[PDB]
Symmetry: C5
Subunit: 336 residues, 5 copies
Amino acid sequence: NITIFTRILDGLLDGYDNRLRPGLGERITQVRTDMYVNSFGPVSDTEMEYTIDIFFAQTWKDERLRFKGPMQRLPLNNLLASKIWTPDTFFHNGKKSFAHWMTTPNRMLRIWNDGRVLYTLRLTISAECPMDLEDFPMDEQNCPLKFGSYAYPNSEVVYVWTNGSTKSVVVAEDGSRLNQYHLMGQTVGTENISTSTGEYTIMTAHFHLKRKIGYFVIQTYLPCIMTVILSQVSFWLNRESVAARTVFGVTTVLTMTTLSISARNSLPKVAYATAMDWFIAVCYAFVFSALLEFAFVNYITKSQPARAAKIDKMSRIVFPILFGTFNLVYWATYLN
Amino acid sequence: NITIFTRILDGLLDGYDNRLRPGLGERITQVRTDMYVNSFGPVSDTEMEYTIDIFFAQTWKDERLRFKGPMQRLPLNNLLASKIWTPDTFFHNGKKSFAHWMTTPNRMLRIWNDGRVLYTLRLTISAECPMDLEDFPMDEQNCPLKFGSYAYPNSEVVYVWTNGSTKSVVVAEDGSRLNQYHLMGQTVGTENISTSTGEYTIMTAHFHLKRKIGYFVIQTYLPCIMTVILSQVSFWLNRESVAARTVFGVTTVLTMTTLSISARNSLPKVAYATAMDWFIAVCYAFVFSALLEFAFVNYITKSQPARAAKIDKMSRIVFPILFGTFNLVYWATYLN
Amino acid sequence: NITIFTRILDGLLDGYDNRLRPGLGERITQVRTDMYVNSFGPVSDTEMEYTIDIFFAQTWKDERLRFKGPMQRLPLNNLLASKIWTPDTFFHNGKKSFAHWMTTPNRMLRIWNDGRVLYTLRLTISAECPMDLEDFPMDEQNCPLKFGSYAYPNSEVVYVWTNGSTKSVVVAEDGSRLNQYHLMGQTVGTENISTSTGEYTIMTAHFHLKRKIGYFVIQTYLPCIMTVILSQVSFWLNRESVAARTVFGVTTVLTMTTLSISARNSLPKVAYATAMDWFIAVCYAFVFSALLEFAFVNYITKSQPARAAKIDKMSRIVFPILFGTFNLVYWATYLN
Amino acid sequence: NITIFTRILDGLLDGYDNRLRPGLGERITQVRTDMYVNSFGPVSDTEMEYTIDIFFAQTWKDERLRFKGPMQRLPLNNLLASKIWTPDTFFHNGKKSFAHWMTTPNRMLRIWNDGRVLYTLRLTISAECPMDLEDFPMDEQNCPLKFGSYAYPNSEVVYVWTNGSTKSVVVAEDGSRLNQYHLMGQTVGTENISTSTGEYTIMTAHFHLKRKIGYFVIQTYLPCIMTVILSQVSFWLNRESVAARTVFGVTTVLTMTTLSISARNSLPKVAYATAMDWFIAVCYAFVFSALLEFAFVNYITKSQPARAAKIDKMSRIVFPILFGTFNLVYWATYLN
Amino acid sequence: NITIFTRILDGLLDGYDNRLRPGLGERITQVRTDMYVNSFGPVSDTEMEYTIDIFFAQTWKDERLRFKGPMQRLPLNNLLASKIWTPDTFFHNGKKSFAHWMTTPNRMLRIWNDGRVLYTLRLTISAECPMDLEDFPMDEQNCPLKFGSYAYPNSEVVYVWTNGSTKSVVVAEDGSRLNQYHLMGQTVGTENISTSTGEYTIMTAHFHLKRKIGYFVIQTYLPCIMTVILSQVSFWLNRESVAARTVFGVTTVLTMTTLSISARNSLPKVAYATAMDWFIAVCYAFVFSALLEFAFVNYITKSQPARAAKIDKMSRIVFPILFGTFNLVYWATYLN
Ligand SMILES: CCOC(=O)c1ncn2c1[C@@H]1CCCN1C(=O)c1cc(OC)ccc1-2
Ligand SMILES: CCOC(=O)c1ncn2c1[C@@H]1CCCN1C(=O)c1cc(OC)ccc1-2
Ligand SMILES: CCOC(=O)c1ncn2c1[C@@H]1CCCN1C(=O)c1cc(OC)ccc1-2
Ligand SMILES: CCOC(=O)c1ncn2c1[C@@H]1CCCN1C(=O)c1cc(OC)ccc1-2
Ligand SMILES: CCOC(=O)c1ncn2c1[C@@H]1CCCN1C(=O)c1cc(OC)ccc1-2
Ligand SMILES: *[C@@H]1O[C@H](CO)[C@@H](O)[C@H](O)[C@H]1NC(C)=O
Ligand SMILES: *[C@@H]1O[C@H](CO)[C@@H](O)[C@H](O)[C@H]1NC(C)=O
Ligand SMILES: *[C@@H]1O[C@H](CO)[C@@H](O)[C@H](O)[C@H]1NC(C)=O
Ligand SMILES: *[C@@H]1O[C@H](CO)[C@@H](O)[C@H](O)[C@H]1NC(C)=O
Ligand SMILES: *[C@@H]1O[C@H](CO)[C@@H](O)[C@H](O)[C@H]1NC(C)=O
């Protein structure tokens, strides 16, 4: 009763060459690909890469595997995978892709009577996702995932998504858990690229990422906001208290300087100004400007005290208003 | 006397196919799984992963391995493991699982006359354990461990725990040693998940983790507590000592600011406020508020000194009481 | 003359099964283990692990390998190691063990006429060594090394050390070079553990480690000691110099606070107080207490200056004596 | 119709030795190499290495593979690659080179009737790129890429670029994306090196790198520039304000000191002065010199106040001019 | 014409056993080793290890490989390397050695008619180089490289350097490029070690390393030197300026303290004082002593101002002279 299956497997492997694609010189092999994202690994901004774990699957038709028997399906494992022909699928953007071999190589091979073949594999792809940090942290990233044949051009092997976009790519509810990103959706597409070796079909899947704010607020913005308010306290102190007001100006300026250096330690070493950088620079101007007002006041406090006192009183009102007004423009400009 | 065993092994391998599960098309294969945790590796909060070393074991019935001989058991090693059929067990949540091959691949294969098979393997699983750090550090984590068949659905292979929960999962006394966690217990369960490929049984084991407090007390809370007390010292200084009291307010505020940044360096970059963050913010208000009182006093110390002196004396009593009262509410709220 | 050896090897492999232990069902296999430590790798306190490189060797008797020839010994290499049976030795505590394959797999196989077999292997074991940091840095660590059979219980395979403890375990003179530890000696032992799978003999080797002090003295203790002395300088300053004495108290307190945070960065995140922590806390009290005395003096310097002056003069003598006395108790308590 | 291809493959492998190069003892094997850079990985300055992902390809003529059939080309995969002879190409400067095996080993093997063979491979090379950081960050780096035969000297195997330089080496538009470098172009060349083993042809490809400035401006230069301006504010303060001006000099000097240490943390530990180091040193002199002027003024402010006041007024103009003039020389000298 | 080579290879492998060394029981195998250092990797002081890439080569005589043919040499690749016998050479001090397999395993096998065999291999050795940091950074390190047979004692296999020391070991001109070391030369030697397994010949190569100074000057020495000068500025300030002089003493002392902690972060955690540590301690005394003089002056400035003024004037001259004199002794003592 079990020996029947053994004979079927031997017959299929008899006269079957794994080095030749099905329907060679007779038609164009058609492969249907479906992907399931078990978990979306962390997105490393420093290296412009992200880690994703998926159960990649491919379906194709092979007439050489036709068989007749009481059972309409033949579930199997990785043992027979190497005995037959499989597409040389690879990721054009993947920097380091490895599979899982424990406890057993996570592979499946299901064959039907008509010859249809299902082959699912588990992979962890450390693909590269370039990011334009011009509106950072109010930036949206579209990380793609490109894969295709390595040796078979479009004229021989063609990859096509199965059913609609939703069924083609599926993400687990708990898989999309990123500490500093939100998975807003997924999209798929196909295209042909012209290469010296030939034309190859490219299967591209794009993931929409919306960075979640709140970590930088407690890390960079809030210390800067409170630092500016700290400097404004000097405006409420007496002019003759030269030493007391000097500490506020010097300490606040240095505090802002170290925050900028510390803030960018985690940020990638990008050679352009980000939105956060402008906010820090503006905050630096307020604290720096406050010290200049105190220095200017102390220079003329002996000649014309009347004007010096007026400026100090005016500064107590003008500076808070400008800082508050600036925030509304800054936050509204990006949060819209 | 020894040659008898050699003949038995040859007979079993004669006509035995390792690509077909036992009892194919006749019944449903039943597998009993028992796990022993040699050591519970570190729990990395930054990557939301934990490392665990276990001696995973599986038991199943195979009639093709029946034999008769003087010895009722046939202890063996990994050499014969590849010669027979084994389940394609895998961890649905494991991110990187590897075995130990030194000195020899840590595997066993014991076979009885009735055909029962025992197969134990040693593995190190770097599984992912998402955590909700809303009550951090007063948070309880339930890290699961999900595993099951990769190619055989529930209709063909079924996993069931052996005996009770205590016997099914065992943790070594010295294995459960975490520098910042306590292993409060273990639990097991089974469920069926509906997938496009089919229905698969899932064996889930949950470990109860109770974070141990005391490291953060010496790291974050105590410096904050002493910093607040340091600011309150300014209330005991003379009002005319403008410079002396200025140092306390400025230095304390900056000290709190750097602690918040330093404290969250180890903490995961979560985009929400934790319990520790609120405690820091409240402590920041006290030190920041103290400076405001000094600034307010210095502004009116010339017009109405009577009220200014009253506030300074009152501040010496009100502020310590509020800080002490706040701690009791904060600690009692979470420690209960 | 050389062809004679070739025939001998072929004869031994004829009818020899590597899947069966020698003397199966006739006696209990006896294995003698000798270890040589080429180099004792670094001891990582953060991960509670240590790296050790050893030339592990095993000796056992096998009658199936008996041969007669002009040469009494047959030196060989790893090529024939896989062709015969070897014990499934493994480390019960090893977290990641790997061998060296360059230039050639470092293995030997020597066989005598009587059938005795010598098999030496080179390994690098990243074992786990839990430590109780209650007296840190005045702590002594006893890192064990447990290994034994994985599939053969005590009733089949037994491990016994050869000769005495000194000969069984040998450490190279230059191998025991640790930047923050001293290798005070080695010890060995054997025991039987009862397991669900059966009873297995355990070969445990313990290494005595005595942490060497001097790195923390220049890193933590000395800055703390000098910081306390710095605060005491304020006692020699005039009371009216409110600003001058304020800097000492504030700066010293903050300096101690940052040292505690910086000091524990390298230390493991243990949720209990160490001996160093108590020393820091005591030093923190002295600097903190000095500020309180200055604040207390400034509060009553106008009402009863006589008592205020007396306290300041007394503080110059009392505080240094207490700090000096405390050190003698602290150092003597642990250094004894 | 498909069986025809199978017979052709068997015929070619019949009597074909993969250990012998084509045309042995009859001519000199000629190999044409073409390279495509999929992505130029990060350039690590600390380790003087860079990561590059390329689709390395080699073409050569082999008469032993001649065949006749309806199809003029025989696309294949890695399965037949090991069955034939391939050059032992290697990178003379590569420190760690690994290929990608997922989903399938990324290799191709195309054979024509005339016997021409195309063999493309995907590799990730962590080559070493020594850099002379004398004009850092205004430095241009020329990272080479050397490869050639390991066992076949120039008299047997010769490597030659195909077509022109542009076609020989191609870089993807999105591949050349470096956070702190610009890919200004590529160049190729060939040379013969005399070695004890023999003469080997070397294929060298040089990549022109132009470091992009702007990250260090926000990291090092700007804090230094603002720090110098901060010190100059003391020149506008009254001489009798000894305490107020003391803070500026001390705080600014320490701020510059920490920036130099922090700035070089990312920079490689080079034992020579860079252009940035000189800029920091000059900025340090200005802040340090300003303190000396204040100290000098305070020393003679009692004897000859007339000269002291003149210096203070003059310093307000001289110091800003020198700092501004120095920047123009510094920036113009390197930015030209 | 090409088939002749194929027959020769088959004949040599006929009756050839790779498990037996040449001339077994007839003589002692002699192996000549020559080494070429392609590049000397970084020397990691923290782990007391260094990385080196070499083209290790071995030459020996084997009469079993004698052949007659038109070609006097048979260049080959790694394919035939495993088919013959090769020495089990290994590095007695190497902690992790791996080869390069891309594009092809970098190995060669050349055989002459007389039977001489040449076998060159490329390796990357992460050997351990213990260092005595007593004169750090004015320290000279002699990193050795020990290798020899693992299974064949001196009585069977002997390693001898070929020709002189210069030819035996060769270092590329661009290979010896270390950011903090100079390669002053190389030396070789041979010795016999007595081991329980037997006597083995050891081939030791020593590399002379002279640490290059200049990185620590800009990192540690210069900030310390300028810090001491900064403290001496207080000697030029008026005694009554208690607050002004207090900042210099406190700020300088703390600045020195943090430099010592920061300086040793990169330095290995050695439990003894280095030359740099003594320099820091001496610099700490000067800044600390200066504060004591100010405190002492302020204590007696009211009783006997005459002596207080004299000390302040004297301090302006004595302290700079002692610091300058100390440097000459310190630098001359080690730089000689
Ligand atoms: C989409 C094609 O199928 C796959 O991609 C694929 N390949 C393997 N497994 C799947 C399926 C897909 C949907 C969810 N899913 C699993 O997560 C899973 C769970 C199992 O239960 C322990 C066993 C196997 C799988
Ligand atoms: C639960 C099924 O058995 C396993 O999971 C299993 N597999 C291997 N070993 C075990 C057992 C389980 C209980 C403790 N235990 C060992 O730790 C151990 C110790 C030995 O002694 C050196 C030898 C073998 C094992
Ligand atoms: C104790 C059983 O023997 C071993 O554990 C063992 N195994 C290999 N080698 C040894 C010996 C042991 C003592 C020192 N020792 C080596 O270090 C060594 C040195 C050699 O010379 C290059 C060659 C081989 C070895
Ligand atoms: C220059 C010799 O050919 C190669 O170096 C080579 N080798 C493989 N593939 C290429 C080509 C070269 C140009 C771009 N290019 C690919 O990126 C590519 C894209 C494909 O489509 C999914 C499939 C294969 C390749
Ligand atoms: C000393 C024994 O020979 C070796 O150690 C050895 N082994 C391989 N290759 C060498 C030689 C040694 C001298 C320089 N040298 C190479 O760098 C090299 C360069 C080549 O050209 C691309 C091809 C092969 C080698
Ligand atoms: C790619 O080529 C195939 C050839 O059949 C064609 O059907 C398809 O439309 C092409 N795709 C694009 C985007 O041009
Ligand atoms: C899963 O399916 C099996 C089928 O036999 C059933 O016995 C079991 O009760 C199911 N489990 C759950 C949780 O529904
Ligand atoms: C372990 O078991 C063996 C069985 O022969 C016995 O000889 C030995 O004494 C036992 N060891 C201990 C520690 O009980
Ligand atoms: C290298 O050697 C070949 C031998 O044919 C010669 O043609 C070529 O010109 C040489 N290259 C150089 C740069 O000398
Ligand atoms: C090592 O042993 C060999 C044996 O032939 C001898 O020739 C050689 O001199 C010995 N070397 C030393 C350093 O004793």
